[PDB]
């Protein structure tokens, strides 16, 4: 199996514009949304059809209740931060929790928080401690670390439960998540050479330009991997052409264990 990950986000907004939810929580497996909840619907709902088809109504009903409580707790926490920062206006609070099951069988687990889109508190599940970025986070860190059983619970959740959920969802969604669609790759002139790939899944891809068999990482322009809208992705990389010497330029693409080379005449 390739590396896979499971992660859940929460967002809280302290003074949202009319209509906009004060709380949103979304789960992902790899790049795929699987679950969504917000303070307007007050319901946890599937975002992938293979989640809807494999989790019975008691699952959605139970986590709907839990998310209603998590929503209130997020509001209380953000209220405490904005009071301690002495901030007026609308501010945001975010959480990300999750785990990865690597190709080689090893695992990672992570939990962190942000205020106004910047790291605020980061959990270390091996030393069982919270890393604080400023003195507001430091005040929170002290209260959270005084609840030692909560830290032990989170370590167990990251290392055992989360990986178990991930394996369960990976099987539910295996027709989507474990498939391979190889890239279609082409080169054109625009002066620079553009190497373009499209139609591939999973989105992880490595594209580079080499000059006479040497990579020139500093001179290459790397495009972002972008969703095409149909479940596949596209990407590109470019390199500028030297008119003063002939060189063999070649595009190199690595995707899902296959390497491809396109030599430019």
């Amino acid at each position, epitope marked *: 199996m390739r590396t896979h990950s499971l992660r859940y986000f929460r967002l809280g907004v302290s003074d949202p514009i009319h209509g906009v939810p004060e709380f949103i929580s979304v789960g992902y497996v790899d790049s795929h949304p699987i679950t969504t909840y917000d303070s307007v619907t007050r319901q946890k709902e599937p975002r992938a059809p293979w989640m809807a088809e494999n989790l019975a109504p008691d699952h959605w009903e139970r*986590y709907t209740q839990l998310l*209603r*409580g998590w929503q209130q*707790m997020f509001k209380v926490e953000l209220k405490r931060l904005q009071r301690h920062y002495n901030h007026s206006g609308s501010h945001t609070y975010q959480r990300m929790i999750g785990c990865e099951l690597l190709e080689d069988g090893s695992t990672t687990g992570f939990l962190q928080y942000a205020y106004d889109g910047q790291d605020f508190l980061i959990f270390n599940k091996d030393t069982l401690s919270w890393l604080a970025v400023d003195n507001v986070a430091h005040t929170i860190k002290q209260a959270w670390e005084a609840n030692q059983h*909560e830290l032990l619970y989170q370590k*167990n959740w990251l290392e*055992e439960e989360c990986i*178990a959920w991930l394996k369960r969802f990976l099987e539910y969604g295996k027709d989507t998540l474990q498939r391979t669609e190889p890239p279609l790759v082409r080169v054109n002139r625009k002066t620079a050479l553009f190497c373009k790939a499209h139609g591939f899944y999973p989105p992880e891809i490595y594209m580079t330009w080499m000059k006479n068999g040497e990579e020139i990482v500093q001179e290459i322009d790397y495009g972002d991997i972008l969703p095409s809208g149909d479940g596949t992705y596209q990407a590109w990389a470019s390199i500028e052409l030297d008119p003063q010497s002939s060189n063999l330029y070649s595009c190199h693409v690595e995707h899902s264990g296959v390497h491809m080379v396109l030599q430019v005449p």
Partner: antibody
Framework: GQNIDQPTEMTATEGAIVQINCTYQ??????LFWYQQHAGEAPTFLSY??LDGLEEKGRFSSFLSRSKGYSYLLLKELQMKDSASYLC??????????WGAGTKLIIKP | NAGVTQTPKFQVLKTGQSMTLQCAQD?????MYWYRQDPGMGLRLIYY???????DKGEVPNGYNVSRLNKREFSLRLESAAPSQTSVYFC??????????????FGEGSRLTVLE
């Protein structure tokens, strides 16, 4: 389904030690609780374990083995006021508590 | 600083009679629970309220209803009492739910006997 098992009753002598066992088979695991309940009274919290090993709290210690699905509550230097039921309970993958039926501890003076 | 206060301690009911059990907590807890305890079996959850403003069924909801009236109070209603509802009822609360380590704080229990 999900099950928690503990002996119905145990009898030990004042001053001695007793180990109360709890085994569990659950869908996921988010921690194991022990509660004390004196006859006619409300249960009260004794301990929580979620990683492997022994934790001590005065005369009571609580042990957990996640791979064996087993915990014990260990009471040392038994006194008459330890006569009570001891309830084990486990949080499953969705944080629901599955409760054992309780062990009644009888102490001989 | 009373913890969890539930009433009444004892009650006898005829089959078909209605009854409300009251529970309040002064600990600023968010989650509340109604359990029944019967001989030879573990506590069984009747209904719960994970936060103010929401409630849901537990494992044995039939014959019961609940009201989370405010953050402090969670009442349990037996609309038409039956002999099988003879039991000891416990209200409980915890700071939050959907976290592993948080423990329950129990009220003193209400003993109900329903007779034909």
């Amino acid at each position: 389904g999900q099950n928690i098992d503990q002996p119905t009753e145990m009898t030990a002598t004042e001053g001695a030690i007793v180990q109360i066992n709890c085994t569990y088979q659950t869908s996921g695991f988010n921690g194991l609780f022990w509660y004390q309940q004196h006859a006619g009274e409300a249960p009260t919290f004794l301990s929580y374990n979620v990683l492997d090993g022994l934790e001590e709290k005065g005369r009571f210690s609580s042990f957990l083995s996640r791979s064996k699905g087993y915990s014990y509550l260990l009471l040392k230097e038994l006194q008459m006021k330890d006569s009570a039921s001891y309830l084990c309970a486990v949080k499953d993958s969705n944080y629901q508590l599955i409760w054992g039926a309780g062990t009644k501890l009888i102490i001989k003076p | 600083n009373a913890g969890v206060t539930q009433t009444p301690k004892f009650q006898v009911l005829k089959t078909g009679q209605s009854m409300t059990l009251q529970c309040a907590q002064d600990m600023n807890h968010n989650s509340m629970y109604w359990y029944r305890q019967d001989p030879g079996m573990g506590l069984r959850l009747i209904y719960y309220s994970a936060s103010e403003g929401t409630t849901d069924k537990g494992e044995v909801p039939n014959g019961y209803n609940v009201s989370r009236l405010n953050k402090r109070e969670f009442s349990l209603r037996l609309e038409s009492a039956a002999p099988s509802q003879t039991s000891v009822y416990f209200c409980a609360s915890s700071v939050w739910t959907g976290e592993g380590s948080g423990e329950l704080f129990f009220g003193e229990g209400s003993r109900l006997t329903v007779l034909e």
